[PDB]
Amino acid sequence: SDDYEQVRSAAVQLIWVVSQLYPESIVPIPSSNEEIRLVDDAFGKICHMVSDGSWVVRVQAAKLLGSMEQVSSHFLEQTLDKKSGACGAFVHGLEDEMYEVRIAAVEALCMLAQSSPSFAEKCLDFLVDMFNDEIEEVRLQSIHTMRKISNNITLREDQLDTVLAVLEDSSRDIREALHELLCCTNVSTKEGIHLALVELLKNLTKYPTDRDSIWKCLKFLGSRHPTLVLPLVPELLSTHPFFDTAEPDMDDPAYIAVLVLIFNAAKTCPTMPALFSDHTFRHYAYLRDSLSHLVPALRL
Amino acid sequence: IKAYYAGHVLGAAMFQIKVGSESVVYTGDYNMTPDRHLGAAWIDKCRPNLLITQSTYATTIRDSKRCRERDFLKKVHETVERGGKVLIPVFALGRAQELCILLETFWERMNLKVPIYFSTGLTEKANHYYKLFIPWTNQKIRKTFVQRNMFEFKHIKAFDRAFADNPGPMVVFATPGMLHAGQSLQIFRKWAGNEKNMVIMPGYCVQGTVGHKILSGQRKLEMEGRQVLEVKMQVEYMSFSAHADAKGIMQLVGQAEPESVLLVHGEAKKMEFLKQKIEQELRVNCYMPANGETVTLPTSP
Amino acid sequence: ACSLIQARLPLLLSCCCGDDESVRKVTEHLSGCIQQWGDSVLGRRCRDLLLQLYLQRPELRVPVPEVLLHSEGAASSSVCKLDGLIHRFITLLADTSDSRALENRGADASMACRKLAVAHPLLLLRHLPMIAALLHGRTHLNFQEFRQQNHLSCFLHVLGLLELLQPHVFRSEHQGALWDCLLSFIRLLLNYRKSSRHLAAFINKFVQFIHKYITYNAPAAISFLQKHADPLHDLSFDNSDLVMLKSLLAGLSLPSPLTA
Amino acid sequence: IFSVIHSNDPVARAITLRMLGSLASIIPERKNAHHSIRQSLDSHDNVEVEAAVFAAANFSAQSKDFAVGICNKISEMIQGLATPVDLKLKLIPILQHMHHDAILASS
Amino acid sequence: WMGCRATRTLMDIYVQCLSALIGSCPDACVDALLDTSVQHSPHFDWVVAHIGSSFPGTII
Ligand SMILES: [Zn+2]
Q: How many CB pairs under 8 A join C and E?
A: 9
- Calpha distance B162→B191 (Å, rounded): 13
Closest CA to C123 of C54, C201, C216, C39: C54
Q: How far is the CA of B91 from the centre of ligand 1 (A)?
A: 11
For residue A281, CA distances in Å to A277, C6, C9 come to 6, 17, 18
* Contact present, B244 and B33 (Cβ < 8 Å): yes
d(Cα B35, Cα B6) in Å, to the nearest integer? 12
3-state secondary structure of C67: helix
Cα separations in angstroms, B89 against A2, B124, B181, B197, C91: 45, 18, 11, 12, 45
Cβ contact, residue pair D31, A289, below 8 Å: no
d(CA A102, CA B253): 25
Paired with B18 in beta bridges are B23
Burial class (CB in 10 A: 0-12, 13-18, 19+), D3: exposed
Q: Which chains touch C (3 or more CB pairs under 8 A)?
A: A, E
List the subunits that have 3+ CB pairs under 8 angstroms with E: C
Closest CA to B174 of B146, B151, B197: B197
Instruction: Provide the sign of the torsion angle of the four alpha carbons A277, A281, A282, A286, taken in this order.
Output: positive
Q: What is the largest CA-CA distance in chain C?
A: 63
Residues 145 through 164 of chain B touching chain A, CB cutoff 8 Å: none
**How many of the other CB atoms lie within 10 Å of CB of B290?**
7
* Contact assessment for residue A93 and residue A80, using Cβ atoms and an 8 Å cutoff: no
Q: Which pairs count as long-range contacts for A39-45, CB under 8 Å and 24+ apart, including other chains? A: A39/A68, A39/A70, A39/A71, A40/A71, A40/A72, A40/A75, A40/A84, A42/A15, A42/A16, A42/A18, A42/A68, A43/A19, A43/A68, A43/A71, A43/A75, A43/A86, A44/A75, A44/A84, A44/A85, A44/A86, A45/A12, A45/A15
**At B74, phi and psi to the nearest 5?**
-65, -40
Task: Report CA B41 to chain centroid distance, whole Å.
Answer: 15
Is B114 within 8 Å of B155 (Cβ atoms)?
Answer: yes
Determine phi and psi for B108, rounding to 5 degrees: -60, -25
Cα distances (Å, whole numbers) of residue A248 to A239, B231, D94: 11, 54, 30
Instruction: Note whether B254 and B83 are within 8 A (CB).
Output: no
Phi, psi at residue A46, to the nearest 5°?
Answer: -70, -40
Cβ-proximal residues to A139 (8 Å cutoff; 6+ apart), any chain: A130, A131, A133, A174
Asked whether the beta carbons of A279 and A247 are under 8 A apart, the reply is: yes
Q: DSSP letter for B37, please.
A: S
Q: Give break positions in chain A: residue before each, C–N beyond 2.5 Å.
A: 83
Distance from CA of E54 to the nearest CA of C (A): 5
| Per-state percent for chain E, helix, strand, coil, to nearest 5 | 75, 0, 25
Closest CA to D53 of D25, D16, D94, D84: D94
| Chain B: touching chains (3 or more CB pairs < 8 Å) | A
* Alpha-carbon distance values, A193 to A178, A232, B106, C99, C162 (Å): 14, 8, 22, 22, 27
Q: Cβ contacts (< 8 Å) between C190 and chain A: which residues?
A: none
CB contact under 8 A, D31 and A282: no
Q: What is the DSSP letter of A191?
A: H
Residue E38 DSSP code? H
Contacts of B37 (CB under 8 A, 6+ apart): B97, B98, B101, B130, B137, B138, B140, B141, B150
Helices (H) and strands (E) in chain B, counts: 7, 8
Instruction: Report resolution in angstroms.
Output: 3.1
Note which residues in 25-64 of chain D have CB less than 8 A from chain A. 31-32, 34-35, 38-39
3-state secondary structure of A63: helix
For residue C150, what are the contacts with CB-CB under 8 A and spacing of at least 6? C96, C97, C98, C100, C103
CB B127 within 8 A of CB B231: no
Cα A287 → chain centroid: 31
- Mapping DSSP to helix (H, G, I), strand (E, B) and coil, where does residue B8 land? coil
| B86-89 and B285-287 beta bridge pairing | unpaired
Tell me if the bond preceding C63 is cis, omega within 30° of 0. no
Cβ atoms of residues C138 and C192 within 8 Å: no
Q: Does D65 touch chain A (CB under 8 A)?
A: yes
3-state SS class at B172: strand
Question: How far away, in angstroms, is B198 Cα from ligand 1 center?
Answer: 24
Query: What is the distance in A from the centroid of ligand 1 to the CA of B177?
Result: 12
Cβ contact, residue pair A274, C136, below 8 Å: no
Q: What is the Cα–Cα distance from B99 to A104, expressed in whole angstroms?
A: 28
CB contact under 8 A, C87 and A230: yes
Asked whether the beta carbons of B41 and B33 are under 8 A apart, the reply is: no
Contact check, Cβ <8 Å, B34/A95: yes
Q: Rounded to a whole number, what is the distance in Å from the CA of C136 to chain A's nearest CA?
A: 6
Distance CA A237, CA A255 (A): 9
- Number of neighbours of residue B11 by Cβ within 10 angstroms: 12
